[PDB]
């Protein structure tokens, strides 16, 4: 009966070339689905599905991983029976795209991947710690850096959108080791960061490096300067920095721009909620 449903389920999984191990699991999970529904698969309603999910999550206390595995098993079972997959199994998802940024841990990995390379390391540190734009970094002059005051002066090409940025201790050390080298180079320029041809970088080359460094760090997410900046501005916010201040630092004329880089992820947002929840 239900055996006959399980038996075709296995035959289908056998056909699809799954391991004995996987089949045994999928089978066991679908069996508990039928056992709980206690009705024919074609007869299963959306509310039935919602009862089964609550069964998994509440009564059986499954983790999400386990919840997902069961759900995947049942779907495959529906597919095996040439039956319609209850739409409620898959359902309409947590909001689609809004841009994605790095975890505080991913940042550490991004930076550290670059400690082999004094120049890379100083480059990455400045973007990660100061919030500057590629381009602004390219046109930094050695004289714009003030290590002792932990400040970079950021001036324009152009419109005069001038400001200072502030470096964290670790960024002060990073640049510091780079400037030691930079200072001994016999360059025809005083740009802070210089290419292998000892000239100012091209905005494009920097993005390549940031990109590659992200791979070298084993980061699934594609890493770009915009992402790093989303990362930084978000961290400052998570750390209690007011939006208007973050705006000052990034050099944004309107908060609408600063909003783009402070869009929080679900985890972050839930934390920020707990931390500042309504009190009644």
TrEMBL record:
Keywords: Cell cycle, Cell division, Chromosome partition, Cytoplasm, DNA integration, DNA recombination, DNA-binding. One of its GO terms (cellular component) is cytoplasm. Residues 1-82 form the Core-binding (CB) domain. The active site is at residues 133, 158, 226, 229, 252, 261. It is found in: Cytoplasm. Belongs to the 'phage' integrase family. XerA subfamily. This is Tyrosine recombinase XerA. Site-specific tyrosine recombinase, which acts by catalyzing the cutting and rejoining of the recombining DNA molecules. GO terms for biological process: cell division; chromosome segregation; DNA transposition. Residues 97-274 form the Tyr recombinase domain. GO terms for molecular function: DNA binding; tyrosine-based site-specific recombinase activity.
């Amino acid at each position: 009966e239900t055996n006959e449903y399980l038996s075709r389920f296995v035959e289908y999984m056998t056909g699809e070339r799954k391991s004995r191990y996987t089949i045994k699991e999928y089978r066991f999970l679908v069996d508990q689905f039928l056992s709980f529904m206690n009705k024919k698969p074609d007869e299963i309603t959306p509310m039935d599905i919602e009862r089964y999910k609550n069964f998994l999550a509440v009564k059986k206390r499954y983790s999400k991983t386990s919840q997902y595995l069961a759900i995947k098993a049942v779907k495959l079972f529906y597919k095996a029976l040439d039956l319609r997959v209850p739409i409620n199994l898959t359902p309409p998802k947590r909001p689609s795209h809004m841009p994605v940024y790095l975890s505080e841990d991913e940042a550490k990995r991004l930076i550290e991947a670059a400690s082999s390379d004094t120049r890379m390391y100083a480059i990455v540190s400045v973007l990660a710690y100061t919030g500057v734009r590629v381009g602004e970094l390219c046109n930094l002059k050695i004289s714009d850096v003030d290590l002792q005051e932990s400040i970079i002066n950021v001036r324009s090409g152009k419109g005069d959108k001038d400001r200072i940025v502030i470096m964290a201790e670790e960024c002060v050390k990073a640049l510091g080791s780079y400037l030691d080298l930079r200072l001994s180079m016999d360059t025809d320029n005083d740009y802070l960061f210089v290419s292998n041809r000892r000239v100012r970088f091209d905005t494009s080359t920097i993005e390549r490096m940031i990109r590659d460094l992200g791979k070298k760090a084993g980061i699934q997410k594609k890493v770009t300067p915009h992402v790093l900046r989303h990362t930084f501005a978000t961290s400052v916010l998570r750390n209690g920095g007011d939006i208007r201040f973050i705006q000052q630092i990034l050099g944004h004329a309107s908060v609408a721009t600063t909003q783009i880089y402070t869009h929080l992820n679900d985890s972050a947002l839930r934390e920020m909620y707990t931390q500042h929840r309504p009190r009644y």
